[PDB]
Amino acid sequence: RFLKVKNWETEVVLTDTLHLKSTLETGCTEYICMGSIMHPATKDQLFPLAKEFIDQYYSSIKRFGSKAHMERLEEVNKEIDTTSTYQLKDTELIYGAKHAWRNASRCVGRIQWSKLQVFDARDCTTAHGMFNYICNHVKYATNKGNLRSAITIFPQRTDGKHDFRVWNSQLIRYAGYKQPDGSTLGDPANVQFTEICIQQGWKPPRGRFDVLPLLLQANGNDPELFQIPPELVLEVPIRHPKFEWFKDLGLKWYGLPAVSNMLLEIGGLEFSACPFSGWYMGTEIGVRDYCDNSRYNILEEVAKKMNLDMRKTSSLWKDQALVEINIAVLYSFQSDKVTIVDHHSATESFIKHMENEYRCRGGCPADWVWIVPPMSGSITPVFHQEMLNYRLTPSFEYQPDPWNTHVW
Amino acid sequence: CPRFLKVKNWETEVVLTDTLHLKSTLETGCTEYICMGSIMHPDVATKDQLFPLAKEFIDQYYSSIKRFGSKAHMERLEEVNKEIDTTSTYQLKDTELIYGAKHAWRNASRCVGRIQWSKLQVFDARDCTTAHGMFNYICNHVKYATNKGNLRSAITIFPQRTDGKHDFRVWNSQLIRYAGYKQPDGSTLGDPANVQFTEICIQQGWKPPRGRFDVLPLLLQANGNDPELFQIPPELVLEVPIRHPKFEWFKDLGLKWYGLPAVSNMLLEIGGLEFSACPFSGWYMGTEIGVRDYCDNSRYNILEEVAKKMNLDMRKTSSLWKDQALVEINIAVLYSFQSDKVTIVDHHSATESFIKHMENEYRCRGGCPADWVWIVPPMSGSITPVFHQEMLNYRLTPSFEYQPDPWNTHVWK
Ligand code: HEM
Ligand code: HEM
Ligand SMILES: COc1ccncc1CCCNCc1ccc2ccc(N)nc2c1
Ligand SMILES: COc1ccncc1CCCNCc1ccc2ccc(N)nc2c1
Ligand SMILES: C[C@H](O)[C@H](O)[C@H]1CNc2nc(N)[nH]c(=O)c2N1
Ligand SMILES: C[C@H](O)[C@H](O)[C@H]1CNc2nc(N)[nH]c(=O)c2N1
Ligand SMILES: [Zn+2]
């Protein structure tokens, strides 16, 4: 059936047909919704998946059923026979990567989906090679502050025993350290990964914002450590435009968000190493990175410097401090001419994107739980936008952390 | 379905196990291939439909009072079954009605206030026959629930549906709301959410003061008859003028709100019986007023005005002038209620209490259905514990349900 979604503020109603294409499960059933749950080959499985993908690719370039299309299916089928897998054409690799992003229901940044620089790293064979490809990625994507969306794609999975993996969750992240008094220095999210780097020979500076080394695994071998050249790591000192004391908090962050632990699936093929990057929405840093209790957890300090009454929750001291921190982050990046988008601008763009997708594509899968910003929700247009969530392929998928699988 | 579903809290790493979802009775809207978790909404029962619905409820009632399989249980079952046979409906005992109403609340996945579910004053209005009588029952409800500012949660239950041509209905969406008036020039005076209903009231004979905060009259339908208008005694309507503890100018905005949120357009379903008029009330979470009522663009929409008074830079969105004024407004709301000693809860306290509630429900009940999209407050989401809490949503009965607006279905006499 055609499904409709209403915006309760504008009363705009869109009609979804695209969902009829999905075949992957969402996790919900007729009786239980799991919308807030974080996460709910063989030759024989391989061909239909390949065919599906080739089909939509030749459909997208308006040459469905053409001679190129027929030969490609023929070529692919044959290749799956003789090798138990197949290799994507470059055009297919790029199409697939862009579409994985386009289909990412949790991403509010998808208006940019077709502007993705795709780096083909499928000829890589070693961790040193991965490091080279990653440096080039970081240098290209950072672009002196004028950030550019990019993805680097390493060889696909074969037997599962020879995976390429970036062990880092992002290319650039800060270390976190367990202190004898039980507190945590730096980013608590990374304490485990940090310990692993230390154990593998990394010499930690033991500061609050130590850029972690890269830990890179090629062809199933043990991972190897590398230091990203610092001149490639763009960082922003956080200051406030009114509170001159804010710089005294000693806060900073990195300009390039570059998620490195996801799995890219295209036409049945699995790319276990596909670091991709765009640019930040301010709340990612200002709200989550800085203010989550399990992260840098800075609210109380900021509230102190702001001299707020912190004896009662109903003074909303937390909320006030939250806004000021997010003002600072936006201001700091903007002042340093580093690309960043505020949650108001981003959500507007997403709404416009949704309309585009409904018009040109018949829908847009979207995860309201993720799309709505972690502050000021209902004063952003997405809060009021009904969304339908469903899984389309190619896609980005989660995968286990490599240190729970790897044998040394 | 799997017997054990786990939910995780990503902040505390606490894992809970749900078994109560097995008792799910109705559809979510979701399927295995699509999730409708952000969709707002995703003639009478025959005898054979009614039988299993009633037994399900009666069993559940007698199980709750630890008399399952007892002589009184079996007898009650037999009496109900016989009553359905001879009349094609049945009447709930007072005990069952009370248990049912409390459980409809306990089961309301969208409600963050459910720690309170067992403290609910139930008013049995099933003897009501006229709209004047409905007015009497509603006044008594308002006065009891208001309690001079020390608010008490309550529900008043009017007669259940029979053939569908004799429904009792409160046409108001809440017992106390402010009128909205569309102007010839396209502007709106008062609350834009209430323009349609206000128009209906005026058509029915109501004379509008045409102010910004005019309490609407009650429009009350008994036994399927045309609805009738009544004015709530103003002394029964407790209100709070909004002021700010720092900004002396905030009072000059002339904002106020009423103390008692009392939703009156929902349907209560118990054991397959339908109570189409069942107004209930609790107390406010500050954000309901300060974020939604005041700052929704399609509501009072005051952000710009507050921002101007705050001398904020409003040329760029990235100044976060909106976020800044939004906090100040919510501070003002909480401060004004606490100052006038009218019960209210901030989103921090409410969400923390709900997490404790949910954990206790998981331990004593085997689950707690929760709608994350609704449970997470409309501001400062991630700095509340509910944002980090995985939830399972499903529909248990007894329950509160939406129903169509009465002016769309009413057969005018
Ligand atoms: C270009 C600017 C972009 C912006 C502003 C943006 C914004 C966001 C934000 C705020 C999230 C929520 C993540 C979180 O809260 O932790 C997200 C999720 C996501 N984004 Fe985007 N994004 C951008 C580009 C990209 C690109 C280039 C890709 C891949 C090619 C991508 C793929 C994804 C995926 C797969 C998720 C879901 C993450 C998960 O499930 O953990 N995004 N995006
Ligand atoms: C006692 C204090 C209470 C608090 C603080 C509270 C809080 C809330 C809030 C903030 C919402 C979201 C509503 C919205 O954003 O529009 C809600 C929804 C809801 N509440 Fe509660 N509530 C309380 C009492 C009650 C009572 C007494 C009942 C019924 C007996 C109830 C049943 C419901 C239902 C059925 C919804 C869903 C609303 C809808 O879908 O339109 N609540 N509650
Ligand atoms: C409940 O949430 C979690 C639980 C466990 N692990 C991780 C998570 C959140 C996962 C974080 N995903 C983080 C991400 C991914 C892609 C992005 C693309 C662009 C951008 N600016 N930011 C992104 C940020
Ligand atoms: C998408 O949202 C809508 C769209 C159309 N109509 C109505 C709505 C929202 C429905 C309003 N629900 C409003 C409500 C219900 C029960 C409550 C109980 C206690 C309390 N403090 N507040 C409540 C507030
Ligand atoms: C439990 C819940 O699903 C979890 O906290 C989600 C909620 N929504 C989110 N939304 C975004 N953008 N990022 C997140 O990490 C999360 N976390
Ligand atoms: C489209 C979306 O489902 C809709 O705006 C919902 C979102 N969550 C909500 N949550 C609460 N508490 N109240 C609401 O009215 C809504 N509206
Ligand atoms: Zn769902």
- With contacts defined as CB-CB under 8 Å, which chain A residues touch B334? 314, 316
CATH superfamily of B127-152+167-238+402-406: Nitric Oxide Synthase;Heme Domain;Chain A domain 2 (3.90.440.10)
Q: Are B6 and B16 in contact (CB under 8 A)?
A: yes
Given the residues B76, B106, B114, B243, select the one marked as catalytic: B114
Pick among B323, B344, B368 to test the A interface (most A CBs inside 10 A): B323
Please indicate whether residue A208 is annotated as part of the active site: no
Residue B244's closest chain A neighbor by CA? A315
Pick the CATH number of B18-126+153-163+267-281+351-375 from 3.90.340.10, 1.20.950.20, 3.30.70.1560, 2.60.40.420: 3.90.340.10
Q: Are B137 and B156 in contact (CB under 8 A)?
A: yes
> Which neighbouring-strand residues pair with A166?
A216
A264 Cβ closer than 6 Å to some ligand 1 atom: no
For the domain spanning A123-148+163-234+398-402, the CATH number is: 3.90.440.10
Closest-CA residue, ligand 1 atom 39, reads A106
Please indicate whether residue A244 is annotated as part of the active site: no
User: How many Å apart are CA B176 and CA B234, to the nearest integer?
Assistant: 11
Q: Please state the length of chain A.
A: 408
B34 Cβ closer than 6 Å to some ligand 4 atom: no
With both helix axes pointing from N to C terminus, report the angle between A317-335 and B321-339 in degrees, rounded to the nearest 10.
170
Residues 6+ positions from A350 with CB-CB distance below 8 Å: A108, A109, A110, A111, A366, A371, A382
Q: What are phi and psi of B50, to 5 degrees?
A: -75, -40
- With contacts defined as CB-CB under 8 Å, which chain A residues touch B376? 377
Task: Determine the distance in angstroms separating the CA of B347 from the nearest CA of chain A, rounded to an integer.
Answer: 8
Task: Determine the distance in angstroms separating the CA of A181 from the nearest CA of chain B, rounded to an integer.
Answer: 20
Please indicate whether residue A110 is annotated as part of the active site: yes
Pick among B344, B368, B382, B390 to test the A interface (most A CBs inside 10 A): B382
> CA distances (Å), B283 to each of B112, B116, B217, B239, in order?
12, 11, 21, 13
> Which neighbouring-strand residues pair with B229?
B219
With both helix axes pointing from N to C terminus, report the angle between B47-64 and B71-87 in degrees, rounded to the nearest 10.
160
Q: Is A86 annotated as a binding residue?
A: no
User: How many Å apart are CA B56 and CA B53, to the nearest integer?
Assistant: 5
Pick the CATH number of B239-261+284-349 from 3.50.7.10, 3.90.550.10, 3.40.640.10, 3.90.1230.10: 3.90.1230.10
Resolution (angstroms) stands at 2.0
Please indicate whether residue B288 is annotated as part of the active site: yes
- With contacts defined as CB-CB under 8 Å, which chain A residues touch B37? 28, 33, 35-36, 368-369, 389
Residue-wise burial string across A201-239, b where 16 or more C-beta atoms lie within 10 A, e elsewhere: ebebeeebbbbbbbbbbbebbebbbbebeeebbbbbebb
Residues 6+ positions from A221 with CB-CB distance below 8 Å: A127
- Interchain pair B11, A342: CB under 8 A: no
Closest-CA residue, ligand 3 atom 15, reads A259
Residue-wise burial string across A97-124, b where 16 or more C-beta atoms lie within 10 A, e elsewhere: bbbbbbbbbebbbbbebeebbbbbbeeb
For the domain spanning A235-257+280-345, the CATH number is: 3.90.1230.10
Given the residues A72, A279, A317, A357, select the one marked as catalytic: A279
* Beta strand B239-241 pairing with B180-182: unpaired
The residue extents of the domains of chain B are 18-126+153-163+267-281+351-375, 127-152+167-238+402-406, 239-261+284-349
Q: Is B111 annotated as a binding residue?
A: yes
For the domain spanning A16-122+149-159+263-277+347-371, the CATH number is: 3.90.340.10
DSSP A248: G
**Tokens found for residue A248:** 């005294």
